Structures are given as C-alpha cells and as structure tokens.
Amino acid sequence: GSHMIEVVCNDRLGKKVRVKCNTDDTIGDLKKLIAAQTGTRWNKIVLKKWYTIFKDHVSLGDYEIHDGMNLELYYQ
Amino acid sequence: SLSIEETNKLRAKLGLKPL
Numbered sequence: 001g002s003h004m005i006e007v008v009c010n011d012r013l014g015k016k017v018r019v020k021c022n023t024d025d026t027i028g029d030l031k032k033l034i035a036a037q038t039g040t041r042w043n044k045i046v047l048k049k050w051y052t053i054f055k056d057h058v059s060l061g062d063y064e065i066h067d068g069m070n071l072e073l074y075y076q
Numbered sequence: 077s078l079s080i081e082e083t084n085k086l087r088a089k090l091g092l093k094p095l
Contacts, residue, residue, distance in 0.1 A: 004095045020077065022093070022095050036086060037078070
C-alpha cells in the first residue's frame with residue numbers, strides 16, 4: 001500500500017463487475033465505485049465474503065483484500 | 077473493465093484519490 005488492485009464483485013444472479021481500486025480505499029469508497037459502475041447507490045450495497053460482512057470505514061488493505069479477490073455483492 | 081485512466085476520472089468525480 002498504497003497499491004492498486006482489482007476486485008471482482010458477483011451478485012446472486014451472476015452479474016459481475018471488476019473494479020480497479022487502491023489498498024488504502026475504504027470499503028465505503030469501493031462501494032461508491034461499484035455503485036457508479038452498476039447503476040445503483042452505494043448505501044444500498046452490502047459486501048460480504050463467507051462469514052465476513054465488510055465494514056464501510058475499514059480500508060481494503062486492513063481487510064487484507066488481495067488482488068483478484070471475489071466479493072459477494074448484495075442489495076438492501 | 078474500466079481502464080486505469082477511466083477509473084481515475086471516475087475516482088476524481090467521486091472525491092477519491094488516483095489509483
């Protein structure tokens with residue numbers, strides 16, 4: 001970090017967006033990127049992976065998000 | 077997916093720093 005990575009976000013119907021981001025971005029910031037790139041609103045997005053619900057104010061780096069990582073995208 | 081430069085312009089628009 002700062003270090004550019006990409007993340008893949010898949011929703012339950014199989015729609016996929018791959019987002020370029022930086023390890024210092026927050027989860028809330030990624031969600032803003034996701035939102036813009038999928039026609040939705042950042043505050044209606046939930047990001048998970050298995051048992052982890054990502055908190056908005058934590059950076060990707062502190063969540064140890066790796067390059068290429070697949071995240072689960074949900075709507076609220 | 078968006079290029080680095082297209083991502084950077086979007087980032088700029090959202091108040092985020094460059095990649």
